[PDB]
C-alpha cells in the first residue's frame, strides 16, 4: 500500500470526500478519529473501536512519552502492537498537551523540541506525524499570535527536516504541518504559506476548539481552510461536537478528533439524532427504547435505555462501555452519513436535515 | 427443554460431573457462576461472559430489589431481558446480603420474608430460586447456629410453599434449599434432613466462606455435603478461590459463585496456572508475555502484560475489562479442566498437578 495518498472522490461546495491510503489502512474522509490518549480508546477494545467504523485513532506523544514512554513503546514493538490497533494512528505532536497539561529550541516542562517530538512519534510508530507546534493561547494579540505562529513555522521546518532525516519514518509515515495564527486571517495566510513552502502531507488547523465558540470557529475556518493546499487533507484538531463536525466539513475539513464521544459517553451523555440525552435522567428508568431509535450499533440492538440508565446510575463499568461504544458508533455513523451525502451531492440537505432534527 | 433436570455423567470419589438442564439452557457442572450483582457481570458484556464459557450467572434479589427494583425489572420484561443474558440466572435469596450489606416473619431492614423473597425472584424471572434463609454468623454457638438454622428450615418450607403457590414459577423455575448449621455436623444433619423432608431441586451449603479458612471450610464440606441428597446439585455459595473450588469439587460440590475473578480482576490480580500475578507490578512493564502462557482467552491472545500493566496503572477501564475477562475466562477453563478430568477419571491428578504448579 502507499505511504500516503489522499484522493478526493467527490466534493460539494468546500466539502470533500475521499480516502487517505496509508500502509496500515485506508482512512475514509471526512474522518472522525476516536481519541486513544493512553494507548487506549477509553472503555473500548480496539476491535470495538473498529466495529463502530473508525479507520484511524488519535494518540498523543505527550501522554505516551511519559507513560509508558516512547523508547519503551518502541522496545515493545510500537504503539500499534502495544495497544492492539493495527490501522493508522495519528499522533498529536505534544504541542497542545505540554500546554494544557503541564524557547526557540523547544519547550521544557515538568524538554520537547521539534526534533524529539518527531523522534518520539517515530518511536511510537506513528503513521501520521504532527509537526511540533506551539498551540496558540486564545484569545491572543495579533503580534502575539504572529510570533507564536512564526515559531511554529520555524518548528514546522525543523519538524520537516527531522522527519526527512529519519529514512524509515520518511518512507512509512506522513507528516502534517499545523497552521496557527489564531483568529487572524493574515497570520493564517502567513502560516499557510510557510507550511506550503515547506511542504507537508497534510495540513491541520490548530488553534481552534479553544473556547472561541462555533460561530468564531466557523468564521476562522471560512478563510483559513481555503488557504491550505486543496490537494491535501485538512485536519481540524480537537473538534467534534456533531454539529461542529458538520459545519467544519462544510468548510473543507477532512479530519477530526475529539474526546467528546468517549468522555461524554462515560458521563451519561448519549448522542441521538434528536440530540444528546442524559441517560441518568429518571425519565429513562423504564424506557425500554434503545439509546437512539435508528442507531445500528450493538448497544442499541441489545440494550434499553432503562438498563443503561441503571448501569450508569450504579457507576457500572458496563455503563461506560455501552455509552462509549454507542457514542463512537454514533460519531462514525454521522461521518458515514456525511461521506455518503457528499458523494451523493446531498450533503447540504443532510446538514439541514441533521440540524433540524438534532436541535 | 426441562424445567430442572440434574444428571451426573461421571464421578470420581465425591466429585461429580454432569449437567443441569433448565428451560433457558444447560449448566455444565461443576459450574462457576460469574457474579452479576447489579444486573451486570462487572466490566463484561453478557456475550463476553458467555464467551469465557459461563453457563449461568448469579444475581441477588437484595441488590435488585433496591435498584432498579423487582416489580420494575418485571415490568421491564424480567432480569434476563433487562441485562441481555438469556441463559439460567441463579438469584441469591437476599438472606446473606441483608446481613452484610444492611423476626420469625422475616427480616426488616433499611421487610424481606420467605414469601417476598420468592415473590421477588419470581419477579426477576429467576431460573434458580434460593430459599430465603438466615445466613449463619461465624463463629456462632451450637445453640445459636441451631436456632438460626431452624428458623432457616422453617423459612425453607415457607419458601417452598410460596414457590409452589406460584404456578408460573413452579413450572419454569427451580428452588434450592440452603443448609445452615455453621461448622456443626449435627446441626448440618438436622438441616439436611429438614430440607430433604421438604424437598428441593438443589441443595446449597450456606454458612461457609465466612472467614473460616479453607481447612475448616473443607472440614465442614467433608461431613455436610454427603448429608445432602446425592441426586441433586450441591451448591457452595460464594466460594471461588481456584484452589477452594478444586477442593470443594473433591468434596461433592457442583456449583460455585464468587466475586473474586471480577473484583480481583479490576484490582490488578490476574489468575495464572502458576498462581495469581499482580499486573501492576513494575516487573510487568516490559513483559510482552500474555497474562497467562496457556490461557485461551481473547485477552491473552491479543495483549501483553506490559500493556495491561500500563492500563491498570493508568486506571484505564480497558484494564478492568481485559483483566476481568481473562480472570473469568481462567475460572471457566479451570471448571472445564475439572469437568473433563472428572469425566476422564483423572480429576485426582489434575488437582495435584494444579496445586503443584499453582503454589
Ligand atoms: N499540535 C496541536 N494540537 C492541538 C490539539 C487540540 N485539541 C483541541 N481541542 C481539544 C478539546 C476537546 C474538548 C474540550 C476542549 C476544551 C478546551 C480546549 C480543547 C478541548 N484543540 C487543539 C489544538 C491543537 C493545536 O493547535 N496544535
Ligand atoms: N442465601 C445465602 N447466601 C449466601 C451467600 C454467600 N456468599 C458467601 N461468600 C461471598 C464472599 C465472597 C468473597 C469474600 C467474602 C468475604 C466474607 C464473606 C463472604 C465473602 N458466603 C455466602 C453464604 C450464603 C448463605 O449461607 N446463604
Ligand atoms: Zn447505538
Ligand atoms: Zn487469558
Curated annotation (Swiss-Prot), chains A, B:
GO terms for biological process: queuosine biosynthetic process; tRNA wobble guanine modification; tRNA-guanine transglycosylation. GO terms for molecular function: metal ion binding; tRNA-guanosine(34) queuine transglycosylase activity. Transmembrane segments: none annotated. Keywords: Glycosyltransferase, Metal-binding, Queuosine biosynthesis, Transferase, tRNA processing, Zinc. Its EC number is 2.4.2.29. Substrate binds at residues 92-96, 133, 180, 207. Zn(2+) binds at residues 295, 297, 300, 326. Belongs to the queuine tRNA-ribosyltransferase family. This is Queuine tRNA-ribosyltransferase. It comes from Zymomonas mobilis subsp. mobilis (strain ATCC 31821 / ZM4 / CP4).
Amino acid at each position: 500500500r502507499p505511504r500516503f495518498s489522499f484522493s478526493i472522490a467527490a466534493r460539494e461546495g468546500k466539502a470533500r470526500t475521499g480516502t487517505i491510503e496509508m500502509k496500515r489502512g485506508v482512512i475514509r474522509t471526512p474522518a472522525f478519529m476516536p481519541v486513544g490518549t493512553a494507548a487506549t480508546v477509553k472503555a473500548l477494545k480496539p476491535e470495538t473501536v473498529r466495529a463502530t467504523g473508525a479507520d484511524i485513532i488519535l494518540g498523543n506523544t505527550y501522554h505516551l512519552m511519559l507513560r509508558p514512554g516512547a523508547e519503551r513503546i518502541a522496545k515493545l514493538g510500537g504503539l500499534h502492537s502495544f495497544m492492539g490497533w493495527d490501522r493508522p494512528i495519528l499522533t498529536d505532536s505534544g504541542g497542545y498537551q505540554v500546554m494544557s497539561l503541564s524557547s526557540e529550541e523547544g519547550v521544557t516542562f515538568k524538554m520537547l523540541s521539534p526534533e524529539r517530538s518527531i523522534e518520539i512519534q517515530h518511536l511510537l510508530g506513528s503513521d501520521i506525524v504532527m509537526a511540533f507546534d506551539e498551540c496558540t493561547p486564545y484569545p491572543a494579540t495579533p503580534s502575539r499570535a504572529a510570533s507564536s505562529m512564526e515559531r511554529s513555522m520555524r518548528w514546522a521546518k525543523r519538524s520537516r527536516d527531522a522527519f526527512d532525516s529519519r529514512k524509515e519514518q520518511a518512507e512509512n509515515a506522513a507528516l502534517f504541518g499545523i497552521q496557527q495564527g489564531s483568529v487572524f486571517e493574515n497570520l493564517r495566510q502567513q502560516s499557510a504559506d510557510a507550511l506550503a513552502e515547506i511542504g507537508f502531507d497534510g495540513y491541520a488547523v490548530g488553534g481552534l476548539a479553544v473556547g472561541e465558540g462555533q460561530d468564531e470557529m466557523f468564521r476562522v475556518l471560512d478563510f483559513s481552510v481555503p488557504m491550505l493546499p486543496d490537494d491535501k487533507p485538512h485536519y481540524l484538531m480537537g473538534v467534534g461536537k456533531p454539529d461542529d463536525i458538520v459545519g467544519a466539513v462544510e468548510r473543507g475539513i477532512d479530519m477530526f478528533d475529539c474526546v467528546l464521544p468517549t468522555r461524554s459517553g462515560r458521563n451519561g451523555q448519549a448522542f441521538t439524532w434528536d440530540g444528546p440525552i442524559n441517560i441518568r435522567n429518571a425519565r429513562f428508568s423504564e424506557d425500554l427504547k434503545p439509546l437512539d431509535s435508528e442507531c445500528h450499533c450493538a448497544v442499541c440492538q441489545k440494550w434499553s435505555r432503562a438498563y443503561i440508565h441503571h448501569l450508569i446510575r450504579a457507576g457500572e463499568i458496563l455503563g461506560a462501555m455501552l455509552m462509549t461504544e454507542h457514542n463512537i458508533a454514533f460519531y462514525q455513523q454521522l461521518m458515514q452519513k456525511i461521506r455518503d451525502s457528499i458523494s451523493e451531492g446531498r450533503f447540504s440537505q443532510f446538514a439541514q436535515d441533521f440540524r433540524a432534527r438534532y436541535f
